Design a protein around this nucleic acid. Sequence first.
DNA 1: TCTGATTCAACTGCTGAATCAG
DNA 2: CTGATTCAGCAGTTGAATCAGA
Lengths: 154, 391, 385, 334
Amino acid sequence: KIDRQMVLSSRAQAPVKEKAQEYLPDKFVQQLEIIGLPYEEILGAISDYLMASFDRTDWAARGEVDETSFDDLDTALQRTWKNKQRICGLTHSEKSEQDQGKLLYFECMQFNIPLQAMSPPSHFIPGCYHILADSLAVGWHPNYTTQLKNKKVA
Amino acid sequence: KRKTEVPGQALGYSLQFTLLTHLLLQAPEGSLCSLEVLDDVAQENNSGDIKFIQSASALTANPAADRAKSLWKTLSNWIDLATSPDFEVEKAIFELYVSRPVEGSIVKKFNEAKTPEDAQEAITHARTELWGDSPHFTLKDGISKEISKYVEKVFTADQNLLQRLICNFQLTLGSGSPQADLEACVRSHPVSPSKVSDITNYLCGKVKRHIDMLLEAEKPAVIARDDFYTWYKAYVQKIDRQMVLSSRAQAPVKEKAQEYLPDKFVQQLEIIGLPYEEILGAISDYLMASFDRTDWAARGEVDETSFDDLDTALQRTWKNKQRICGLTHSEKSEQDQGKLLYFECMQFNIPLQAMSPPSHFIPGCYHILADSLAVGWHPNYTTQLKNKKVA
Amino acid sequence: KRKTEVPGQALGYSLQFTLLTHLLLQAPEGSLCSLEVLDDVAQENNSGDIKFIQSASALTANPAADRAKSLWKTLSNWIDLATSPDFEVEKAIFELYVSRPVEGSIVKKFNEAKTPEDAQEAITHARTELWGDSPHFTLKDGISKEISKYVEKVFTADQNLLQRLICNFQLTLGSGSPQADLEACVRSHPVSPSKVSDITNYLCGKVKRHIDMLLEAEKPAVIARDDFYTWYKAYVQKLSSRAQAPVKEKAQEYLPDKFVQQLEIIGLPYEEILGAISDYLMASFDRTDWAARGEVDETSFDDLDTALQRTWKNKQRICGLTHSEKSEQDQGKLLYFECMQFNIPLQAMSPPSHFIPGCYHILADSLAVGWHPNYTTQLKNKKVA
Amino acid sequence: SLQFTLLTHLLLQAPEGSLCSLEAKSLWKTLSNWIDLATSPDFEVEKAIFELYVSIVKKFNEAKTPEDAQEAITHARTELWGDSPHFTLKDSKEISKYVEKVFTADQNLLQRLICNFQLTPQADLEACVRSHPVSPSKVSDITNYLCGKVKRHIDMLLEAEKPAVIARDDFYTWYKAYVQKIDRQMVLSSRAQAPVKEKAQEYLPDKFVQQLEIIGLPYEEILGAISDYLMASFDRTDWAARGEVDETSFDDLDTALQRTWKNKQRICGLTHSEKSEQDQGKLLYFECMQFNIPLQAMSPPSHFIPGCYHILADSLAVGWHPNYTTQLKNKKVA
DNA sequence: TCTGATTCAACTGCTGAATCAG
DNA sequence: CTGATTCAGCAGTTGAATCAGA
């Protein structure tokens, strides 16, 4: 009551259940499973995609976030992706490529960063993470592109 | 006090700026609030309605009296303005602001005469008290020289014009201090009570500054309501910020700690074999975090939606940390993994509403989530709880 | 416009508040600045000085002209003030603040006069120009009725009293906008030039409102400049990069630097040295830009460098001890990237996403820090080969 | 020293102009370089304002006007060069060269120069800084920083054979920027100094040094630790002394640090149990030396958290070895 | 007995208009 | 053709003394 916000309080609702199966053929998905990632949190990340995209459109339409904020946020997030990618590639090389991919995914999802000095919701970071995964901007598997090409034929 | 200094009448002009600021704070969107353009203060809204004001800073004398010079001069001036051609008198909502609560039969009847017949009655009362019964007008010769011309112009003007002028005439009168009657208006806004005394005297200063810079260039002094609210919001974003949350919880006594031992989170802690002192510290952190949550929600320090976001963030971090913990230290006993998980989330921190929480708030919230079985430290914490609830 | 409104006359009273604020900003320590108490605007210091100021908002007139109601009324009023039996004029600095920069034959003589003998010649010129020659006073009857009484009171008053009043008289012209000379006073203080308006808007908001609240209670309107500066400091106490990405051709010129020597000491896909050199350039430009235009102190840069150096040292020890079961090739890149994931803020302000790695690169160009377990020994090894 | 202090004072009392101030051969030489520097194409004498803090000099002050400046220069040449047609007073060459440079230079430029030739030390500078909208506690720090920076900027020009001139708009871009760091609370400034080497060994028998030597750190690490100890203790004293920090904030910081120890020691011990206990202590030391938390949402110096850990170690509130309680007792006997 | 309205005298504010000096 | 005179008519309401009403 009688509070004040001046922060990215994204207005969104529970995503439609069918869209979870609808977005299954999406590129970020077949980036995901190829590291042995289970289907339940696959659906969770799919939902996170849905609300994250809806909130991105909401901010772009109504207007609370400058355009350069998304760009430099994603640039920093991609740099962090690559840094942790190499970190897990070296310090965890003494085991399977599958587990390397899943540990990279886990250790990357914990990252947080403010936007315009203000805190986004907890679901936003995985959403932009998988958005980068959509356009080959980030990858969880150490050789993700090769396995993506292999699975696109099978 | 010398005669060469006039503090009481300089306030008669300062009150114009104060009333301009208050009018801007009350003005609808799309309006222009002008100072000495159409009247002492004025407001022209989008629909073309013009609202005049005749500010009258009364400290000692009464400008609303029946035979007051100021009231009758103001009414004569407004009837002259209504006489002007191409004037839409319906929209011209006048006002005689007075800095103190004033009384008077004529002025009160004028103020309360919404209906044109009520206005006819009010003007009849004023004419009877100032001139006498028609048509002899036995009291006409006795009226004051200063009031004579204004009385003549008001009473002998067109009947319909005076009727409407009195219909939309008002006596909006504030408390003894209009400045303190203006700060209250800012307080009524959704503004932090600590920052009202800063927003008010930034808005007044900006209004005075802009008006001065307009009138030194001979241009008509007018502040757009859109501009005023743009400055208002831009300053509110700047100044309305709180930085550090101070916890008001107290460390519980040792005796109270054992009352919570049968709680689920204590069971989870002793499943992975934490020592007794660490368990007691956990009870203390639980109590402080719960009290902090309840208090901050109660007194508006932190919104409940902020607590929901915090809880979701803690759950997300806990699951992301548990999954990596279950594979980086897999070559150990499950109790060791539970200690690692619990301690790593113990070290973790995250701000609430972009504000740093106390050192015990996050551990206590994690214990809250453990109590509700939302999270867990042991890898098989649910199975261990089920097994231990039977033994 | 109609004659029932007086905006230009309202400026005569709003300039009271404006000049009160402008006097408060420049008030000597321990002064009480008052509005419509001793004069239009006054300032009293601890040494007993008072500075009466008859602010005039000249906009379509000339209050400092030779024959004006304003100037002579002001001088007669000050002579009346000084005629009081409890008021010495040795500390009675007067002022005739005018909104416009105006000049007059007599007001200039009064303003430039500083010594009693010069002031005597000033009054002699004033009498000669207005009353006329001393014995005849031919123009005395020509002097206007409005000015006659005031000029009579000025000239017939005590000769030494008027002499010292003219000596202490001062003409302080504005610049056409008294509100843009206040902001000039504010921007001459240690405040961000982007925030100069925000202070100036707020300060007058105090200076008006408080004074207003002090007159609405029928009390003297005096602001203690200590209180004004209390509000001022309490208000004052309550990063962006402009380094564009360098062209690829400019990147190769930095290859001979020891910075690139280290990056590849422990090797590192050259797909690196391009990004590393880019970060080097952006940080190098950002440091100089922020130092010059002014957003971060240079001592702040020194402290940031010290913090990154200590973090590099501790991270080097940690990485070596933990990952000693690896070849130096691995430990080098492990120290590297972990050091590049350090997120200290610059003087409590969050730097852009590249600033910290770039500053690490800048420090690594020197001999201080490097991302290799034994980078010092191999520095010469690669240099010889 | 005074030349670099009154220069700062004059830089504070100057509106948007170029500035300079120096300390008879001495009187004439400085104005000779002033006229040479003014004749440089970039200089604008109108905005320039000089100073010669310590009859002809009195006239130089008294002018404030091109005609009065011409009169003062006329007095000067009449006094120093004798009769104009003959110049019999020409016969000391060292000063005479500067007089030739000055009196034969541009009449308009020198005439404008003499107008700005004002004449004229720490207490008044401090008062002038105090009169600005800055906290009264920070005035000494700002004064010292400004004097140091002005000295540094003048010396770098002097070594490069360049005229000694400081622009006021170049002084305030330093001083306003410093205020943002120090006046606004967001940053803590450490007034503590690094201890000398000799005084450091006096703290060798202290308990935190014993702890670190039990962990077997190199001899430079313990010296750095002692320096952090002394500097952080000085900062603890001074921050509370001047009210820049509160005691409850110190209590909260110590609570957070103790909680950090609790997590880090257990995690290092059970995660690196296979490593030797001394290596576990070194790992714990270097891992918790990475911790940095704002003190009152206010960034501390990079050494302050290590020094807080060192004072906690001196009171045994923190420790690096897993069984350092037994190790200290064992070493106290040997 | 005092709060209050009434009649008037009265300090301040500086623009507007017709006229006039250089 | 700008600037200065001369006078004028708005505004600001308070201050001081007198009378009407409880």
